[PDB]
């Protein structure tokens, strides 16, 4: 008797877990868009901003971005 | 005489007792069996609901969710 109603259990399962996977594979999509939210524009300047005989070189980075995202 | 009596009330018990468990393997199927689920659509959100420095942080989870059971 018990190997049909463990069958019976493992198939609907399979069909629960096949469709979750499905579901999840499409639900993915949105997140695949924000990979793309920004672009640099221009040149960028790069400047020596350290403090005379620091021991740390420090510089500094300035860059036009454009963020076409929502956050 | 007596033997065959008793293999015939252990055939006769046999057979009730066997079907019974069938009766019983049957009458498993409903409970075991139940399709459909909570199935997931699209992408959901998490936002930060934690507010006035509170010591636990805490998060809205918004989603769109489709229950395929009847229950
Ligand atoms: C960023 O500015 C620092 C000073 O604000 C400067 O430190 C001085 O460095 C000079 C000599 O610089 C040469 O040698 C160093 C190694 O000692 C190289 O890293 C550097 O590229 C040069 O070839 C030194 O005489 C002086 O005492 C230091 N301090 C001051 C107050 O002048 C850094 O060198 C400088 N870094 C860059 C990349 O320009
Ligand atoms: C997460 O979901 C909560 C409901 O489950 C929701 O509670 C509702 O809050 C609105 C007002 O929310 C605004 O103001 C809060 C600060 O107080 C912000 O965090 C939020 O972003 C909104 O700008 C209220 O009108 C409503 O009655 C509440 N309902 C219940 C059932 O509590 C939370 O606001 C939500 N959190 C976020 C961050 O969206």
Redesign the interface.
């Known amino acids: 008797?018990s190997g049909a109603?463990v069958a019976?259990?493992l198939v609907?399962a399979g069909?629960?877990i096949a469709?979750?996977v499905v579901?999840?594979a499409?639900?993915?999509?949105?997140?695949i868009s924000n990979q793309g939210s920004i672009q640099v524009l221009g040149s960028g300047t790069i400047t020596n901003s350290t403090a005379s005989g620091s021991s740390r070189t420090i510089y500094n980075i300035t860059i036009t971005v454009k963020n076409t995202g929502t956050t």
Not at 26 to 31: E, V, Y
């Open positions: 008797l109603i019976l259990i609907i069909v629960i469709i979750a579901l999840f499409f639900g993915l999509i949105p997140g």
